[PDB]
Each structure stands twice: as C-alpha cells, then as structure tokens.
Symmetry: D2
Subunit: 463 residues, 4 copies
C-alpha cells in the first residue's frame, strides 16, 4: 500500500498510488493551515517551467536525453491539467515556496519513472532534485512559474474586463436619451443623462484595463538562472538563454531574462504593482455597485431609477422582495481584494537581503484577487448588467419637479435672484417655472428655451 522515500532529514511512507514524495508529505505536516490547494494555473505554469528546464538541460548536454524525454512527457501531462490532485501542499507555507517547487519536482519525477517502467520513489534513476530541479533553485523556478501564472490569469481578467466595459458602453448607448437628476452630496443638482453616468462607468473601467494591462510589463522579466541568490554562480549562460526562449514560447508570453538577476531575485515590486492596479479597479467597481444599489432602491420608498434582473428570492418573509445581489457580491469582492492587497503589501515589505520568504502568502493572495475579480466580473456582466432597465417615467418626473433646473437662469438673471426663487419653491412646494412667470423674472417663451432639461446636459449658457 505504501513505498518509502528519504531526504537528508529521514524517511517517510508515501501511498503507493501517490506521485508526490517525501518533501511534499513533510510540507503537509509542517503547514496544515488553510486546507486550500494552489491554483491550477500555477500548477500548469510549474509544469511549463520543468518542461522548459528539461529541454534546456538536454540541449546543453547536462541532462541524459533518456530520462529527460520522460521528464518532458510527465511535465506535459501536468501542463494539460492531468495531475492537479497530486499538488497537495498549502498555499500558505514556510520555506519560501520550496514545498511548492518540490511538489512539482516529485510528481513529475515519479510520473516520468512510471512512464519508463520504473518504480515510483526510485530517485537513483530520476531524482526530483538532481534531474527535475537541475540548473534550478526554488528561488528561480517558483517565482518564474508565478510570473507565468499571473500573466496568464491577468490576460484572462483583461479580456473579461474588456467585455464588461463594452457592455457598460452598450448600456450607456441604450440610456443616452434617458434624462434624470444628477446628485452631489446626495442633494438634487442639475439634469444629467443616465447614459452619461453609464459612460462614466465605462470610462473608469477602460482606465482600469489600461492600468492592469500595463502591470504585465514588469512581470515579463524572469530570473531563471539566478541559482540560490541571484548571482547565477555556476549557471550556464547558454542554459539561461535557451530556457528563457522555451518559457516564452510554451507560455505564450514575451518573457525576457532579467538584466540583473540579483535585483530580480530579491525585489517583489512587480507583484505589488499588480495588486495595486487590481485594488484601484475594485475601488471603482465598488463605487459603481454602490450607485447601482441606490438606483435600484425601492420599490416605493426608494429612488427606483433602475430595475436589475431578479436573480434569487430576496426574503422568505417580505413577500416578493428582490435584492441587488449582483452589485452586492461585487462590493464584497472589492472588500476582499482590498484586504488581499494589504496582505501583499505586508509580505512584500518583509523581504530580507537576497530573498523575500513571504512570497507564498503574497502569491496566494495575488492569484486569488485576479481569479475572484474575473469570476465576479463575468457573473455580474451576464446576470445583471446586460439586463438592467431604466424607470424612465420616474426619472423624468424628478427632472420635471426639480428646483435645480433653475441653475440655468443664473447667467441671465443672476445667482442672487435664482436663489430667492429656489428657496421660495422649496418652501412652498411650487414649480420653479411657475414662480419665474408669476414674478416676471422671465417670459414663458424665454424659459421654454432656457429650462429645456436636455439642453443643460452639454456645456453652454442656456439661450
């Protein structure tokens, strides 16, 4: 039922059908923290790293082509997502990612052994350390795999967010004629188009796409060849060049060998720069969600400017309640990303000399942020945003009854007079138009032009 493996600390039993090994099992004893598994994209990227390294090591004559070809086939299986269940270590873990790198090394070595008809655990023939980890350290393989995983996930977030942004733009278009009252401080102000607010939403999101896209650039620099500390001592420059080109080609990213491997091994600014752009994006999305929730308030004692698609019963006790559950989950995902960014800040700040050992919790958080933003943006776009409808009559009635349309008469008649009219209209509950007429401030004809609400929506002195 079990086999026995060993490292410099001793021996352990492994289930015979497991592809992980001794260093993996030790990580499960050392760090039973969350019970989560690493993201499958990171597993995939680990497999891209070990395939790339095995090819490069063979090409430069360091690795036996017999063993190397099986390492490559096993790594391809990992890349295709065939072995996600064998990656059992905790995302939150001591040892700076060694246990993640070793989980990859062990799984690939053991699967390679099985593919050449050998016994799993026979590290004499295929060693996790000496073959699958050849020319590598934790301190290059783990971050390089993370750069690749983060880049692949960012590319998916970007595509999802461009889709959402475009759906905001379609709503802006659908609502381009819908007039309502703009509010500042939650006080009635002057008229605005609902489509102008939705375009404001589309535009901030366009700016977020650009910020997030631009954070990829610093992740294209990888540190493969760094060895233990970034000096690259005893790394072969031809190994570095060739592994880099394989990593680029198999991952699909324009990866580059960092110009200064010590810089690239010990600094973590590439990661906080990403987390920062994700946070900024979710600030904007939370604000947008808060607006949607206010606009959907009601149905009788709220603003009731829009109707969201109903997505689930709101209450078992208020008959027929529907709640804005999709904006609410967007807010919650924002609050989660805000927190993840503080965990990332604190972990990046904790780096010491040649290595930041806090990267596992940094990378867990950063991947989680990207992943939950992708998922909530997809679900919000499909289950809410596309289906939003406007209560046009209600919003028109707000404009029809406002005081603040009176703003438009300031350049003609003065803020002082308009204020007197505004105060009176507010205290009597009369229409501001009627008051202008009854006091001879303006004629019916000239305030038909001046108090045109649609015309006040683009710049100019009315008239």
């Amino acid at each position: 039922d079990v086999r026995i493996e060993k490292d410099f600390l001793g021996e352990k039993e492994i289930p015979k059908d497991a592809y992980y090994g001794v260093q993996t099992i030790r990580a499960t004893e050392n760090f039973p923290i969350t019970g989560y598994r690493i993201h499958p994209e990171l597993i995939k990227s680990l497999g891209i790293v070990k395939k790339s390294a095995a090819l490069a090591n063979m090409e430069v004559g360091l690795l036996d082509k017999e063993v190397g070809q099986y390492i490559v086939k096993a790594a391809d299986e990992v890349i295709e997502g065939k072995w996600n269940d064998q990656f059992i270590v905790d995302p939150i873990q001591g040892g700076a990612g060694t246990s993640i790198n070793m989980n990859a090394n062990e799984v690939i070595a053991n699967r390679a052994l099985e593919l050449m008809g050998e016994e799993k655990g026979n590290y004499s023939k295929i060693s996790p350390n000496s073959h699958v980890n050849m020319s590598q350290s934790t301190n290059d393989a783990f971050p390089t795999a993370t750069h690749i995983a983060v880049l692949s996930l960012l590319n998916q977030l970007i595509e999802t967010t461009k889709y959402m942004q475009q759906e905001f733009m379609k709503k802006a278009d659908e609502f381009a004629g819908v007039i309502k009252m703009g509010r500042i401080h939650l006080q009635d102000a002057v008229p605005i188009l609902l489509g102008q607010e939705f375009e404001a939403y589309a535009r901030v999101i366009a700016r977020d796409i650009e910020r997030i896209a631009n954070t990829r650039n610093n992740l294209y620099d990888i540190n493969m060849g760094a060895t233990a500390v970034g000096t690259g001592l005893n790394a072969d420059p031809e190994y570095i060049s060739i592994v880099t080109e394989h990593l680029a080609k198999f991952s699909g990213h324009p990866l580059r060998s960092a110009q200064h491997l010590v810089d690239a091994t010990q600094n973590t600014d590439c990661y906080t720069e990403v987390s920062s752009a994700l946070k900024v994006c979710m600030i904007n999305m939370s604000k947008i969600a808060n607006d949607l929730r206010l606009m959907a308030s009601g149905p009788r004692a709220g603003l009731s400017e829009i109707v969201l698609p109903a997505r689930q019963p709101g209450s078992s006790i208020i008959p027929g309640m529907v709640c804005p559950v999709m904006p609410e989950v967007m807010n919650q995902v924002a609050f989660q990303v805000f927190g993840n960014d503080l965990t990332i800040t604190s972990a990046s700040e904790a780096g010491q000399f040649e290595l930041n050992v806090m990267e596992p919790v940094l990378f867990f958080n950063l991947i989680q942020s990207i992943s939950i933003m992708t998922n909530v943006f997809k679900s919000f776009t499909e289950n809410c945003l596309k289906g939003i409808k406007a209560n046009e009559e209600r919003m028109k009635e707000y404009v029809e009854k406002s005081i603040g349309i009176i703003t438009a008469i300031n350049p003609h008649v003065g803020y002082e007079t308009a204020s007197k009219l505004a105060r009176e209209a507010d205290l009597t509950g009369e229409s501001i138009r009627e008051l202008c007429i009854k006091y001879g401030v303006l004629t019916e004809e000239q305030l038909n032009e001046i108090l045109n609400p649609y015309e006040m929506i683009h710049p100019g002195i009315a008239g």
Copy 2:
C-alpha cells in the same frame, strides 16, 4: 436522475440524490466566486439554529409535531457533520446570507422528507421556507448561527493559544539562566536573559488571550426573533425566550436575547471587535517570529543564538541548509489576518439602515482568521517552539566581549568617563575590563562585582 423544484422566480432541475434545492442551485449560478465551501463549524451551527427553532415552534404550537420531529432528526444529522457536502454555496455571496440560510433550510427539509418516507422536493409536506425557516428570517438565523460558530471557534483558539503560551513559559524557564546581549535598534545594549525575552513573549500572548476571550461577551447577545428588520413584528415573545434557551443549551454558550433587536440586527461591531483582537494577537506573534528568525540566523555569518527543530530540507543547492519555516509560516498567517481585518473593516463600514448586506465576506474572513490562527499556533507549538535550543556558548561570548556592560559603571564613575572608555574599546577592539584597570578607573576587585553580567539583569546600581 433529477427532480424539479420551484420558487417565486421559476423552476430548476436538482440531482435526485441532492438534499439542496432550487434556491441553493441559483446561488451557485449567481455567485461562482471562490469555489470555497463554508466552514463546517458554521454548517453545524446552522443545524443548531434549525433544531432550536423547530423545538421552539412545536412547543408554542406553531409547527406540526409530526413534521417537526423529522426536521429535528435531520438537523441533528447536520449538527453531527453528516451532510457537509450538501452545503455548496459560495462564502462570498450577494443576498446577505439568504443563500446560506436557504442551503440549510433545503437540506434539512429534504432530509426530513426522506426520513418520513416522502419525496425530496415535496415542499407541500415539508417546506424549507414555511416549516424549517418558520418564525425566522435570514437576518436572524444567519447571524445567530455565525455568533455560535465564531464563539465555538474562538473557544478552540483560546485553548490552543493557552497551550502555546504555557509552552513559551516552559522555554522561559529552560532558558532562565542563559545570558546574552540585549539589543536596541539592533545595537548591542546591556545583558539580558534569553528566558526574560521568552517570558516577554509569554506575557504578550497572555494579554492576547485575555483580549480575545473578552470579545466573546458581545457575541453572546443574539437577535433570534428580529424578523425582517429587528422590530420583531409578529414574533411571539415566548418563541423568542424558548429558542434562546435551546440555542444556549445545545451550543454550550451562555447566549442571551439582545435587549434591543433593531440594534442587534443592524450593527456589526461585535465582529470587528473580534477581528481587532485577532489582528493585535498576530502583530505580536509576527514580531516574535521575526525575533526567532533573527536569533536562528547563520550558521556562521548570523547571530546564531538559537537552533530550531529542522522540519524540511531548506534548499536543493545549498548543501544542508535549514530554514526557520515555522516562524515564517507564522509571519504569513499574520499578514493574512491583517488583510482579513481590513476586508472586515470595509464590510462592517458598508452597512445601510436596518441591515449590513456585506456580512458574508465579513464572516468568511473572520472565520478564516480564527481557523488559520488555531492551525498555525498548533503546528508552531508542536513543530518548533517545544524543541528550540540555545547556543549558550555563543551568547556568553557576546556578553564576554561587549562594550555595553560598561553601562554599570555610570553611577560610580560617570557617563562621561564610561563613554571615553567605550569609544576607546570600540576603536581598539580591546576588552572594556582591561581598559578600566589599565587607566585606574576601577580596581580589579570592585569591577569583579560591578561588571558581573548576571547581576545587571535585575534592577539596581551594581555594587
């Protein structure tokens, strides 16, 4: 293979062997955010809530005793942890916890139906809403279950942390004779006992236990009977009294019916008060961990004051490296709790009028904090703290070679003279004792008493 269920929004297919229902499946479409499951303690507590309610509702004559007895048996199964797999909704979810409450209501209703020989889905006989949720709202059942789960988890953290605190105290005792140099600003200062530092660690942790224990008090107030908004309109006061006593008795906590149900339904300060005490605790533990990592630095170009149990190979490329992986994972768990507390802050701040809809992400975070602190504290206590050893010779050599022992001569001979001696000793690399003798500041006899390092470890003018 499937059955069909319905709510006021429409019909859905459910796998025939599933105990969840239509509202559950809708939550899985609305919120595919994390893919996590709610903590099993919360599942258990939901079952305590629905059992308690069913008993109270029968006792006051609202619920049929035939259906009620099966609801109770099903809820007991949930309480014992037999149905954790049927709780499939995302911890991060819109609808303020409705989908969590409905997952409980559905699972219990359906299991109850199966126990009385009926068809799952036959809500005519046993309704998730009308029977299992009777006299309840999301807005009391969900927070009440959370109070119970948080209290049970806090009690386990407290016990784990008292164990850790006691193991720190044992190390303080083991090291009570071990002399070393105290450092301020990382500059050599005056002698201290290693056992005094470990007692400083034990004492802050004692203070953390007290803070965390004291946060339970505000969670003992529950809001069962609140109905939709806290008014309790149409709740039966005898139902409230009786359900409270069952909740207390089955959960083991001294629960109390809040004095003002509107306050208790809309305020979330009980939760941030807990998160705050957890954060403070992890600030202290991170600092302690950082100290341990500095003391274990080396082995030749570091401080090398202590040796930690080796827990995994440190490197595949530095021969025989061992890294302080257990302190490192403690730091990472701190950074995670710091972030979780910011998510909790932001979610509590977002409450509006009669309900804080952001509670799902608040409660996910708070439970995660308590849970990961418990797990890392257990693992750190067993896999590191108990086994720590002191390099007594090294630390003694620091004291033997220090400048700063010279502090003790200030009251005798003046800070001005001691400074001259200190500077000289620092620039020549001579022993400060020899300099005192050679310049006739003190006799060999009087500085044998005065520069006794052990005596400078407790208050007094040396002499």
Copy 3:
C-alpha cells in the same frame, strides 16, 4: 546670537535664546519630515515624567537637592504649558524617541540653569543627560510619558463620546413615535420607528465607550525603572517604587509598575489595542453618518426623511443647495482613523528584540486619532445631532402607502383578505388603512391600535 554646546558627537551652534540644545538641533536637521510639533499633552506628560524622576532621584540621595529643586520648577513650567514652542522636533523621527526625550531634558536643564542665574548651555552645572535623565532611558521615559498622554486624551475622548451618546438617546426619545419604512438591501421592508434607529446608534456608541474605556487598563502598567531594556540596570528599586507613585499622583491616573519590565519595554500591544477600539468606534460612526446622509438626501429627488441644521452654503452655482457637511466630515475622520490604524499596525509589527523603534510614528498616529475623534464628535454633536429634525408627515405617508404595512394587519385579517387588500392598494391610489375602513374589514379604532407606531414595531400581535 549663538552659544556652543557639545555631545558625544561634537559641537553645534544653538540660538542664544533657545532652551533646547545640541541633541535637539541635530534632530531638526536629521528629521525635517512633516513640520508638525508633538501634541501639547505629550509635552505636558514629559514634564510630569522629568519632575517625577527628579523627586525620586533626590529622595534616594542620587541627585543634589538644590539642583533637583530647579529641575523640578522648570519641569512644572513645562507641565503648565509654558514652553511648548521649545519642543521643535518632528513627531516622525528616527532614534526611537531619543530626540523627544532629549528635547525635554535640554529644555528643562536650560530653564533650570536660567532659574539659578547660570548660562544656558552650562551642562557642567545641570546636565540634560546626567541630571535631568538620571536613572532613566529614552526607553522608559518616552513610553511612560506617552502612556500618561494617551490616558489623559482617552479620558477626554470618553467624556466627549458619552455626551454624544446621550444626545443620540435624546433624539431617540424625540423620535420615539416617528414611524418610517425600514430598509434592507435598500429595499422597502416593514415599518420601523426613526427612534429605534437613533437608539441603535446610541447603543453601538455605548459599546464603543466601553471598548475604549477598557483599553486604558493595559496602559496603567508603565515601565518607568526599566531603563534601557527592562533590566533596570542603574535604577535603584526604591527609586522605581517612588517615581511610580509620583507619576500616578501627578498624572491623576492609577499607574502601576509593570510586573515584568522587559515585557513592558519591548511589547507595544497596549497601543494597538487602543487603536483597534478607536477604529471599531469610527466604523460605527461612519456607518451612522452614511445613514444620516441618505436620510437627508433630497430635497425633491431623495429620501428627505430628516433635516440637518444648515451649516454653510452648499454651492455657489446650484441655487438653494445645502449639504450634510457634518456627517461628511465624520466619514472623513473615520477614513483617517482607519489609515492611522494600519500605520500603527505596521509600526507595532516592526519591533525587534528589546525595543520597538517605530514608536514615534505609532504614537503620532495614535494621539492624532484620539484627538481628531474628540474634535469631530464635539463639533458633530453641537452643530448637527442636537438640531436634527424629522419630516414626520413624509415618513408617515410612505408607511401608509407601503406594501410592508400589511404585515401588522395579517394576523388580524388573515392572508386571503390581506392579499386582496394589497392588490387593491397597488391598483388604486389608496392606503391599506382607508381600504380596511372602506370594506368593513377593520374599524378605524382597531386600526388605530394595530397600526399604532409602537405596536407595529415591537414583538407580539
């Protein structure tokens, strides 16, 4: 125009009329960061510390009675707030607070010298280090002073908060009969009294008062006598017991000498505990302020449930605009405190071995939090909360025309009739009450009982 002073590092020019000295001037070159000054209460508390130490050192025969007496009189002037302008060092400073301790030691020494007719700078007669700092370290004097300052500031915050909490409870009373629509998810639910919301506000604030008051307890333990690292090297144990008693008696706080001075010198959890309770309080206050600003929304396209006292013009372009400026500044002070608390967290976490050197920024933020909360609570209470008025008729009208008011009538009339009444109410203009009367379902007298605000908003039928 200058004198020359000297420390371990060499000599510096000091303005002839200055009471600070060489170690102070160096700090002003090293840390020109914010341009702020330390809080006057911290200056005061430093004066309490140096007075207390001078008395204890004299009593134990370590300090000259005559020189000690002048140190004490100079310290008393500092305590009374006469020399705040001589405390020039930046609150954000390296050195772990040495520069603040030295600013006190120098000002006091020099003023003491002036009081005995000597020249400022004559450290031969009265030394900042040897006399004013005798038996002490930065690492006990500076924290002890901070514990005392923070305690004093907390006591004032608590009194201000208790005043605000009581004014919320008066508004709860004023509004005890005012009915409105409760909202969950911002969706119309069932009726609630405005007074119940204000009471929920007052109750959370009561809980905050308790949390904050309870953070004082760990600050009453001081480390005076710890000297450099908590070992108490060069502090006589009788000096420690005497200085502690003077610190308690002059400060008015029940200070205690910590049970383990090494613990109390290196751990900073008393400070994060305080910051935490301040953050939690401001979370609740921010939420309350958010609710107020929603209730004040309008005048015609908003909820318009309450009217806040007008405090300033809202706009120089929109005629008639007035804005909820006092809830808004409450929000902003919350966001400030949240941030201050993260700075405090990060500084506390950065402690190393025997000393946390990041205390200056930690204490600057903590004292800032306490201070801005006191000031905004006072201003918000006097300029907004006391004057809040309810639009009772508006709120009643929406309750009368809601769906949710059906909930009060359901057990009386049964679900079948309730549904028919609800349907009619949707399609006609009419309130459920009027319809109950029109169709003889309930009598006007029975509806007066059933839809009584208190009765629709409490448990029972």
Copy 4:
C-alpha cells in the same frame, strides 16, 4: 474690529483686517478637526485656477475687464505665496472642498477690493460667488487645483528620487568589489557583492520612478468647465477651451480638457493610482531600510557589515551607542504612507453618483504622502546614503571562512575533493583557500581567479 458679511444662510462677523469672509469663517466653526492648514502648493494652484478663470471669463465677455484685472492681480499675489496665512480652513472638512474654494474666492475678492480702494466685504463691487467663482463650481475648481498641485509636487518628488537613485548607483560602484555572504531566510548562502545589493536597490528605485512618473498622465486630464456635475451647464464652451490653455501655460503642465467631463467630475481613480505608486515605492524603501539596519547591527554582537554616518547620540545611558536613525525614519515614513493609502482607498470608494465628497481627506493624505516622501528621501540621501562605508575586511573574512565559498571551487575540484575540503574547514580553523593551497588542490594564482569577487558572483564557471 469686525465687519459684517452675508451669504445664503445669513450674516457673520469677520475680523476687520481679514481677507477671508463669511463662508470661510463658517468652515472654521464647522471643522476644527486637525488645526492644520492646506499645503502651500495647493494654495498656489488655487490662485492659478482663479487667475485662469478670470482671464477666460473676460476674454469671453462675461466678466468686467476692470474688475477682472484686480481679481487677476490679487490671484497673482496668492500664486506667489503672499497670502498663505489667510487660508485657514482645515484640510479635513465636509462640503467636498467648497470651503477651500470659498476661502480662495473670498481672499481673492477682498484683496481685489482693497486694490481698487474699496472696503473688504463689499461684494456688491466684487463677489466671491458671482465674479471670482464665475463659470465654475467647487467640483471643477477644487479638483483642477488639486491636479495641478499634485503634479507639481510629483515632479519635485521625482527629481528628489532620481537624485537618490543615482546616489545608490554610486554606492553600488564604490562597493562593486566588496564581497560578502548572501543570505536567504537569514541563512548563510553563497557569496554576493555588496555592490550587487546596492544595485538591486537602485534598480527597484528606478522602477519606482517610472511608476510614479507614469501616474502623472491621468492627472493631465482636468475637468475645468464641468461646473457642478460635468454637464458644463453655465460654462461657455469657448471659456472651457480658453481656461484650459491658461491652466496649462501658467502651471507648466501639459493639461488637457478631459474627453468626458462627467467621468472626470465623479471618478477619483487618478488619485488612487498615484497613491498606489507611492505605496509601492515606500514598500521597497522600507525593505531597503530594514536591510541597512541589519547590516549596521553591532558593534560586537551584530553583522557589522556597514557603518552609517553618525547623526545623533543613540543613548544617554549606554555609553558609545549610535543608532541607524535615518533608515529608521525611512521605515516610519513608509508606514505613514501605507496608512495614508488606506485612507485614500476608503475615501475614493465612498463616491456617490456625480461627486465624491470625501476628496478633502483624500487630497490631504495624497499631498502628505508626496511631501513626506520628498523630505525623507532628501534627508536620507544627504545624511546617510552618501556617507555609507563598508567593513570590507570583516565581510571578506566571513566569506573566506564560509561553507558557501565552496560553490565557486566545485566545478574545478569535483564534489569528492570539495567535500573533503569542507569537512577539514569545519574541524580545523582554516579557510577553504588556505586548505586548497596546503593540499596542492589549486594554485594560489588559480584561486585568485576562481575566488575573485566578480567571478564568484556572476554566471559561468
């Protein structure tokens, strides 16, 4: 001693000699929160805004040429920093910045009145609202001024940072030959040059310069002309084009009128983008400062790899102590910025519909971050970084007696001999180099090449 002024809300007494007015005095009663004043660069930028608007309004025939000319001269005095003392409102204030805009409008109006020989307060002749605020809102004037202030402050930070970055690169050069032990997890690893660490420092700082410089781009889009909500109601489109050009030309920044003024009036992402780049920079700087403080640990029980310039006595009780005060204040400024960034995050998130009213606290924090970073970078560069010295012999000695130096010799000597050499080195006192010589394994000349600092620290064999 007083005059009387009046707004929409009524009349107030103003000190006769004050240039501020009624809306300003009300703000000083409403918000006595911090006691701070807005940054002088924001005052300056407000003056640029009001000058620019007065010129555009005149050009378009909306404002009297004569009154406009006095408004402009008064604005120019504000721009030159002559009236900073008249800006008394608190940076933390409700009203979304109205009180800051009004403080500018009032000071300028009153000074303009004094320049034409009129009485301060005579708003009949020159109105804060009607003339100085003409064609504007708080909601365009205040942000536009902030964009300009922040841009100016960023440009100074960038220049200061570039100076610091270059001084790190000079130290990398000075230390290019200095070998020491690289450490991972604080465990001894393999040799590294001190110069490579300093170059890693310089390179991250280069990346920070780039991030921060790139945040300017979104600030060049301004919303002047948006008026209340971005619709531009009451702003003539030719006024918008002319005021934008004046704003660019007087400020020296390439300002552009935002493409959608409603977007630019309600969204605050340009500000969080800036705060984010500042936070990221200070994360890196804090880490660097942590490393410096570890390298400076000692003198006898620490690493003692570097010596920092001494800047102040470390202790008045421990003789001889000097502390790394300049890295320490760098840490503390980082923690400050981290917190400021959370305040900024929370304020930005709190935007509602057409306006984010939490901008005053957001801008106070953002400007504070930029300002304290500039000041600490300058002071740290001049008072520490330039003067850092290496303990080269100490560092070399530990490299020579390490295990890790074996790594350079392994491919030359093969694993079997390397292990024998390592074992011997552990048990005897002797360095691997000496042992290589003693046992004829390698020649002294071959060891000079192999263990050359540059050669053991770069890829290859």
